């Protein structure tokens, strides 16, 4: 439930091939950017960093949980369906 890993913007790159090492079966890669992750305070900062480095980018809007109406008393409604059958 914690939300502390949803505060900052991140930049990541496309995933490329990983293959099995013939000797040990380990996951080999030839992609030098496979583990590169950058943290930014705002979308604008991340976009500016991508442009000056020449990377084409896809920005995705921040998804914020919608505010909800919570009511403990609705659990015992006289005539509504929100009445719970157990606690």
């Amino acid at each position: 439930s914690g939300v502390n890993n949803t505060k900052k913007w991140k930049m990541e790159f496309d995933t490329r091939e990983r293959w099995e090492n013939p000797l040990m079966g380990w996951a080999s890669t030839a992609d030098p950017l496979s583990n590169l992750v950058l943290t930014f305070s705002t979308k604008e900062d991340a976009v500016a960093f991508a442009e000056k480095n020449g990377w084409s980018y896809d920005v995705e809007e921040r998804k914020v949980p919608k505010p909800k109406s919570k009511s403990y008393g609705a659990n015992f409604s006289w005539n509504k369906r929100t009445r719970v059958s157990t606690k």
Binding site: Y72, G73, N75, F76, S77, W78, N79, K87
Partner: protein, 430 residues
């Protein structure tokens, strides 16, 4: 004013058939003044009825002691389309308390009239009486009285000729001390597990079936008709101020004659035990400790019991509470640690399990207390037990968690030397 309290007269006693020596059916109840001018009371109006109760100074007899007049007036408001109900708490579960049993089986018509008079004050259409399932015979007595009242026009359509419609329903419990808690009682009537609700909402807004509700103790409701007939001022002439009226007392444990008796509020605890119960077994000096208001209240040692009065404010000063006014007496032959450990074992068996501090905490306290009984512990654990109880108290949904912490705190407060001495004995055998 009155400086000394007690020595109540039979003319001022309310529950005049406490011992069932007279007829409990309508014929007897009517001869004793019940159902008299009930029409006059009903036509006087809810606000007048609430005035008589507010002026009487009546406080809840269920164990929390909230002022009844103020509490009952939360229902005094316009209907919004929902029915309104009065719930009478006849679960009588607190160990040591058996006062409500005598009203139900010997004075049922005071309860039935109390429901009508109290129900009118709140504008309720019906009363549900929740009576613990174990009281099978008492509940059957109550149904006979209700049928008599229905057949005599006293309740039902146009009750007492007042033009007010009232029904009295009796619903039985199935074995659960927690179902005496006001919201757990409501959840039980609705057919669920007896698990208390959080507050808000309060029952006066969302109660049984989601409708406005007031939960009142059997004794609180049963005395209400007489307070209106004889007046609130007459009721307030008893007991210390803010501690008004006559209270039913259960004296059990190590007394010569355990009994139930009606006595004035603020009576000294010593006078109550000796005047009515025949004194402590082995004499007063054989007293070790008393639990004044049922198992939920902390014990007090003999030194406090010497001068303490029996009312809400007097016993709060002695670091306890009036509770249900059920006096459990323990003489010096008692294994005090064991006696309190059996009470924690009771709360362990009665916890509903809903909320963490009681579900886990009370069971934790039981395991520690069992070890304290044998002394198989270290003195440093006494302060751990004190701290654990303080994490249960005031963090639970309902007051059962508080009622399990208090007996532990009372034992540690007044009998710490006994606990440590027992631990020393155990260690020297090992």
């Amino acid at each position: 004013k009155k400086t000394s309290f007690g020595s109540l007269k039979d003319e001022d006693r309310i529950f005049t058939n406490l011992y069932g020596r007279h007829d409990w059916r309508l014929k007897g109840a009517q001869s004793r003044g019940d159902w008299y001018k009930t029409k006059e009371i009903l036509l006087k109006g809810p606000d007048w009825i609430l005035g008589e109760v507010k002026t009487s100074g009546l406080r809840g007899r269920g164990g929390a002691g909230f002022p009844t007049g103020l509490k009952w007036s939360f229902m005094n408001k316009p209907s919004d389309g929902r029915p309104k109900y009065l719930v009478v708490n006849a679960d009588e579960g607190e160990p040591g308390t058996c006062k409500d049993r005598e009203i139900i089986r010997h004075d049922p018509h005071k309860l039935v009239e109390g429901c009508l008079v109290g129900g009118r004050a709140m504008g309720a259409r019906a009363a549900y009486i929740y009576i613990r399932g174990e009281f099978y015979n008492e509940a059957s007595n109550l149904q006979v009285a209700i049928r008599e009242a229905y057949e005599a026009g006293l309740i039902g359509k146009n009750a007492c000729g007042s033009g007010y419609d009232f029904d009295v329903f009796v619903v039985r419990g199935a074995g659960a001390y927690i179902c005496g808690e006001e919201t757990a009682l409501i959840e039980s009537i609705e057919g669920k597990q007896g698990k208390p609700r959080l507050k808000p909402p309060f029952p006066a807004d969302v109660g049984v079936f989601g409708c406005p509700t007031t939960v009142a103790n059997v004794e609180t409701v049963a005395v209400s008709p007489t307070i209106c007939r004889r007046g609130g001022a007459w009721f307030a002439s008893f007991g210390r101020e803010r501690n008004s009226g006559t209270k039913l007392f259960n004296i059990s444990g190590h007394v010569n004659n355990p009994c139930t008796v009606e006595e004035e509020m603020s009576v000294p605890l010593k006078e109550l035990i000796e005047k009515h119960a025949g004194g402590v077994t082995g004499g007063w000096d054989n007293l070790l400790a008393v639990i004044p208001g049922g198992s939920s209240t902390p014990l007090i040692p003999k030194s406090v019991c010497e001068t303490v009065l029996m009312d809400f404010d007097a016993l709060i000063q002695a670091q306890t509470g009036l509770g249900t006014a059920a006096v459990i007496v323990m003489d010096r032959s008692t294994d005090i640690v064991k006696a309190i450990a059996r009470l924690i074992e009771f709360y362990k068996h009665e916890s509903c399990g809903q909320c963490t501090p009681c579900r886990e905490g009370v069971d934790w306290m039981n395991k520690v207390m069992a070890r304290f009984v044998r002394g198989d512990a270290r003195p440093a654990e006494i302060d751990s037990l004190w701290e654990i109880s303080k994490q249960i108290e005031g963090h639970t949904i309902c007051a059962l968690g508080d009622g399990a912490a208090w007996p532990v705190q009372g034992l540690i407060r007044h009998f710490r030397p006994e606990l440590e001495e027992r631990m020393q004995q155990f260690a020297q055998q090992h």
